[PDB]
Amino acid sequence: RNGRDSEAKRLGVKRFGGESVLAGSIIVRQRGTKFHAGANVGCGRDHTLFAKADGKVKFEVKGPKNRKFISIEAE
Amino acid sequence: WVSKSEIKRDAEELKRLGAEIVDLGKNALDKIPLDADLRAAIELAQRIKMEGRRRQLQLIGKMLRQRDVEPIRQALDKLKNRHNQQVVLFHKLENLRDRLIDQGDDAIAEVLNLWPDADRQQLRTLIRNAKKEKEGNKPPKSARQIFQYLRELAENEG
RNA sequence: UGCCUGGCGGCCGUAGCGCGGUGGUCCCACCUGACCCCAUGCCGAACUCAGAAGUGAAACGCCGUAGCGCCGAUGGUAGUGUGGGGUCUCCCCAUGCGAGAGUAGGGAACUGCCAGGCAA
RNA sequence: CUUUAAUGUUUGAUGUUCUAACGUUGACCCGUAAUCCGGGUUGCGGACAGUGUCUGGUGGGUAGUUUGACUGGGGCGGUCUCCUCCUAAAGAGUAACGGAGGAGCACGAAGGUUGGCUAAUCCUGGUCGGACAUCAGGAGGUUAGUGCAAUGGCAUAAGCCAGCUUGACUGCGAGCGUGACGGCGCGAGCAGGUGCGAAAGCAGGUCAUAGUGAUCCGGUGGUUCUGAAUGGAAGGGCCAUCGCUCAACGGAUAAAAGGUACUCCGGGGAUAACAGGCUGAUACCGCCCAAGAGUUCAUAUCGACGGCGGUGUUUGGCACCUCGAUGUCGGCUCAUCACAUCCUGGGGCUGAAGUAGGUCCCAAGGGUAUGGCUGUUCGCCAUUUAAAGUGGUACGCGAGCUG
RNA sequence: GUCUCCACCCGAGACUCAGUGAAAUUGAACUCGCUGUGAAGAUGCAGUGUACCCGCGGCAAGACGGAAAGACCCCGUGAACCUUUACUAUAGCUUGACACUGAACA
RNA sequence: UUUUGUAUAAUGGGUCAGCGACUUAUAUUCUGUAGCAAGGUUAACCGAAUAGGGGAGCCGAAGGGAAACCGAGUCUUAACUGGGCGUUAAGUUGCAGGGUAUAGACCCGAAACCCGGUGAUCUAGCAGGUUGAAGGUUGGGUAACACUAACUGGAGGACCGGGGGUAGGCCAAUCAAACCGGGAGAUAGCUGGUUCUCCCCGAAAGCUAUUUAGGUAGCGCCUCGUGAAUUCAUCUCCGGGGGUAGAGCACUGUUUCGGCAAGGGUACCAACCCGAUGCAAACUGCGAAUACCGGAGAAUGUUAUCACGGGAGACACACGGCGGGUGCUAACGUCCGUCGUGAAGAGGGAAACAACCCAGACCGCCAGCUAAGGUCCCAAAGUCAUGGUUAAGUGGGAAACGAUGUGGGAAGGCCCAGACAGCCAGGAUGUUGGCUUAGAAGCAGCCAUCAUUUAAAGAAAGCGUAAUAGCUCACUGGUCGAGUCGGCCUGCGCGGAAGAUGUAACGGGGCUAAACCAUGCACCGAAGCUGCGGCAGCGACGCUUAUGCGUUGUUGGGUAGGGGAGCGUUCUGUAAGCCUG
């Protein structure tokens, strides 16, 4: 009766820290909001993170709930 | 729980009904209570051909999925019943003629039983003429006369 | 330059909670009326309008309280990449990394700028 | 011109008579001493019958085809698309006839902006009302809710309330992720004009992930784009939209059901009807625990419940070689070998005073029938003896014999 | 053993194509027996034992003997067969219209 | 040859000589080479003609868009900072070769379909009956007919035991349909073959889709050519993020203990829950080791990296290890992610055995070293040493169990106020019990489990009597006396370990150490390494600049597949030349 498996949505981190990426690149493909947006980072309707400018990615813990945020530094 | 096999069978039945109504002529469509949009779609399907016709038929079936079909089924059933009655009468006439040509008095007895007013002498003469035509490779004039006589007897009985 | 107060940021549970003391000198609240600005799926309950009469009840800021939460070593241990071995559905050897909890210890937050009362 | 009609014209239908066409396998005469055929007269029906085209169904009697793929032999059962969790081994992705499930909707609002708000888990008091209907307070801070089944995250709330609106708009869109590809998703920003807002700002749909169908072709509106000598028209192309359980869902036909042990061809130990070996849930033999039974006493004899050694004699799995062939089960002769010995010999034990014995060790040197029952391997019964023991050897031997 | 109740022999019916001086067969052989393994049962592999070379007459344990590109079974968007209320069409059938096919009349 | 995997008892071949397997035509794409060059080029045809004429015609030098239309720019838009496609490289004719599509299309092996005939002297057919109208006859009727009651002949074509005609039945004894000539050498996702040599490189049985599963298109991977950057790889440092192992219950479940215990029908079942206990692939308040990639870095690796074009092959993988799904944690059952082997690599050792251990062959040499494995012989090395174990062929199979086989470890108690066991003696008497008095009196049992003499005797442990009785033992005196008993760690052993062609579960000999534990020395031991010689591909430096190298280092296992380089024979010009009775 079981066995129906859906094709993977290709979820996970696409761009990591310490690497130069261009504007419009996708950093993480996640269903929820495991990682939130920070400086020079935008979040789409489907929780898709993208970079608003060229630079290096960085991860930082902030917020009362200790949530991880992604930022871009113009390096 | 609804079985996808049952769903597919129902879809096939709906598509068969759509094809049947499309094949049905103008008088049959007028008799059947078809809404304006469904009638227009059926006319468009008839006008078009090729894969377009089948896809329009599939659209008709999809519409029938939601629209009620009981009146349409009843109309089709009554029309098919009338057509089958006519075809059965024709088959009975043909079989009776064949039996008259083949056996003879045995079929004459059945003809008389079915229609007492039938003329035994005329039937015997026609059967003998048909046998002579068969022997002499003549046209089936006697067979056609027998068919006409049987049709007249059936009409008189009805 | 210090006791303090309000706002804006970093770190954001060593930073936070329970207990006692302290403050109306600046600032903060309650409060009188709301008929007039505004507001309730009813109500000045909440927000807001002119005042500050009075006080610090409650909140709020500071100190001590380790009582709790929390962080936190060192070692050991489970585990694990590499090659091998054995009484090989398990374990051991040499090597690299290495746990969680607990443990010594810490803990009443700290820190940058602007504006105001007091003493300078 | 609706409703009227003598009068001059046209055919259509019904009914009566005639035959001049037609039929005459009706007769007579002639080529012809010619049952065929042709030429003439006549009777009988006669515009009928039939003749060629179209029009209706009947139509396997007849012709061309079809009935998909996967499966612990096969048949049979079950699946064919998308999405959430684990299988799936901490980048990503990852199959199985795996384990749980949901979807082929819906919203002109449940969408956008702006301005505000935040449940249960329980207790306390109260008419129905009590464990739980509603109200006020309290530990409480998302475990409530977040339209769907589920995943994540949602407190800055993506959750709830309220004024206004359609940005769910128009042509794009550098770049990025994904996939072989088609294609899909995100995407800063450009030009026009809109909704909210004093503004920075948001609005290119639903907090996201399923609600899906490409291509060819048809309807609708436009486009003089073209328009085959000219001007048109017709026809063709372009755009937007409406059309598929084309669910066999990357979609061979608009169109298709049974078997053939009457079969043929090419292939298959990818795959079987039988045979060795690898395997051991189950079954068989022996033993430990063995409560206790056995007058009593666990072992003269059994020995509940579990546990441990040998056998592969049936049920359990690959076929690793056998479809360029392994002819299966009965029977007749030959059987060798192991003793877990039927007795035959040497022996120990007692509930063995002796035959009798029951149990156990060694001992294969010896032998281990005849009839009813089935083609049977096997199994029961009767008569004697010391007995009528078991196995494997391709469930032996049809290259020893018998169908 | 007349005959039944059938069974067995001595001689015929009923039916029954060895024949060339051949044959199936042949990759090559100086072609032993057991144990273990081996794409799993060894004339040919590892160990071990036996055996003078080659003929003649018998036995048949083996050389997965030969006689059929399975006579078992399945596969093929292969063929053919038949069955039909499977698809597409046809012979024949019957309905009416159109010319052959008319003339007088109500 | 098919299968990942072959002599295997999966296929095939008797030998010899000859015959034979990718050619050719039409268009297209690409590589080498020759001319011309913004031109090249001819076709048919003419042509005393492989010459010449013939520019008809064909391709680019400019394209975009479906087109109109525009133009070094064009296409959707009112047009974009726009985006799609153009210029900043030069096209053509031939030749030779690598592919694609159609023609037989590398070749062979089918059934079967259609067209016109040979068809019946073999055979199926006039055998036979029946169904059965046709003719006649007899019989009622009628002047006579029709019809009907019975007999006969049997149409019909069949029913019955050469695209047709008449029991894979017959038409040449395998015909529900033969042969001949042709479509047609039909087609086949199928079987088999594909013939000379040398050198270099040299993968996979994987992903997507398939009226689709042994096949095919793209990707994945391999080869050749072009172009291009520390291009890429190992490792060090630096940046990250998992929810995997571990650990744990913050949350969701799950089994139990004791309860609060709604609810249910108060000695009785029980929800939401509390603390603990374990567990969770579908739990993570915590969280690794590995791995992922990104930035820097010395070193090495023939640029081992990337993009494009031509050509492939393959698109059935099996075993072992590692963490798993399913099967019974059983497989040489099946499916997953990764490394190795083989497939694509032989070697040496494990006796032989693809998957077990060591180890990647250029060739040659009568040289040595060495890996795994061995050093008593077969068969080469120690009958080697050091401190121990084995009395059982353990080594040379097997497990729970029982144990005076043996050497040690921690130790307990008793111990010349003479330890245990030996040698001489006692174990007397109410306790014939009330109790089931049948006699159990201790010797089967309710029962007290007491009581004087005491160096010493229990109202009772065995043997032994129907019970009595009698013989031992609990404890006790005389002599000797020094060691004695039970359990565990125990390494090595014992029975459990009995089966069938002939020993066979050490290879054998045969070993009491020639078996095992730990060390050493050296030796043997591969195609691994080195010692010498020879051939070939490769980048360079020094000449040569087309080829020789002074040379360096490096490579040379190889299926399929790809690239490069060569030899054998027939014929044509060379060649009216050369050899040759």
Side-chain angles (χ1 to χ4, degrees):
Chain A
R1 179 260 296 178
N2 298 326
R4 301 182 300 275
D5 185 4
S6 63
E7 52 259 18
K9 301 294 98 185
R10 297 288 297 99
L11 304 171
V13 179
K14 307 300 180 180
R15 302 285 79 92
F16 305 103
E19 73 191 22
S20 59
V21 300
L22 309 184
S25 61
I26 305 304
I27 303 83
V28 186
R29 286 297 310 275
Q30 58 185 16
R31 306 285 71 170
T33 319
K34 298 287 187 175
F35 302 92
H36 294 252
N40 299 120
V41 176
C43 181
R45 51 180 160 275
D46 60 330
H47 294 178
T48 299
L49 299 75
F50 61 93
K52 298 182 179 300
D54 175 72
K56 300 174 65 176
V57 177
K58 182 177 179 61
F59 303 69
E60 63 88 1
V61 181
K62 180 61 179 178
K65 302 185 294 181
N66 299 329
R67 293 182 296 180
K68 303 174 180 177
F69 291 75
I70 314 304
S71 180
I72 297 301
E73 53 276 7
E75 267 63 10
Chain B
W1 173 265
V2 182
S3 56
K4 52 197 160 191
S5 180
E6 180 178 359
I7 300 174
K8 181 61 176 181
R9 286 174 289 184
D10 300 330
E12 181 63 13
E13 293 178 0
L14 292 174
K15 270 65 189 180
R16 182 186 62 181
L17 180 61
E20 290 167 334
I21 60 177
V22 168
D23 300 330
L24 284 179
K26 174 60 174 182
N27 302 328
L29 297 175
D30 297 322
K31 293 173 63 56
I32 297 168
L34 303 175
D35 60 77
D37 301 330
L38 186 63
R39 189 64 166 276
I42 292 287
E43 294 294 350
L44 179 60
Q46 293 178 2
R47 290 186 188 89
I48 67 187
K49 300 183 180 181
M50 211 84 277
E51 169 59 5
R53 183 175 181 274
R54 190 190 64 176
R55 295 205 283 95
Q56 192 65 8
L57 167 58
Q58 293 169 354
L59 172 63
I60 292 288
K62 182 177 180 180
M63 297 303 93
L64 292 172
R65 294 178 187 273
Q66 304 178 7
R67 287 175 170 80
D68 186 5
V69 302
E70 189 66 9
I72 312 306
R73 289 184 175 275
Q74 167 273 353
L76 179 60
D77 292 330
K78 67 175 184 60
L79 295 175
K80 292 171 64 177
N81 179 22
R82 185 185 64 178
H83 194 59
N84 295 329
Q85 288 176 3
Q86 295 181 0
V87 171
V88 168
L89 179 60
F90 184 78
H91 288 175
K92 184 63 178 62
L93 294 174
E94 281 192 339
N95 299 329
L96 192 56
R97 182 182 64 179
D98 299 330
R99 293 181 65 177
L100 292 165
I101 294 169
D102 299 330
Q103 297 181 353
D105 299 0
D106 300 330
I108 294 171
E110 183 179 2
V111 171
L112 294 174
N113 299 330
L114 294 174
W115 300 282
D117 59 357
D119 190 331
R120 176 185 285 271
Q121 184 63 11
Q122 187 178 0
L123 292 174
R124 166 173 281 270
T125 303
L126 293 174
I127 291 163
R128 291 181 298 179
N129 300 332
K131 291 182 179 181
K132 293 178 180 180
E133 289 175 359
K134 180 180 178 181
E135 292 179 0
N137 72 266
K138 293 188 290 183
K141 180 186 182 177
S142 300
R144 277 184 286 268
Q145 288 182 349
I146 293 168
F147 185 91
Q148 293 179 0
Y149 194 80
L150 294 176
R151 182 182 61 179
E152 291 177 0
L153 292 175
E155 185 65 11
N156 300 330
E157 184 181 7

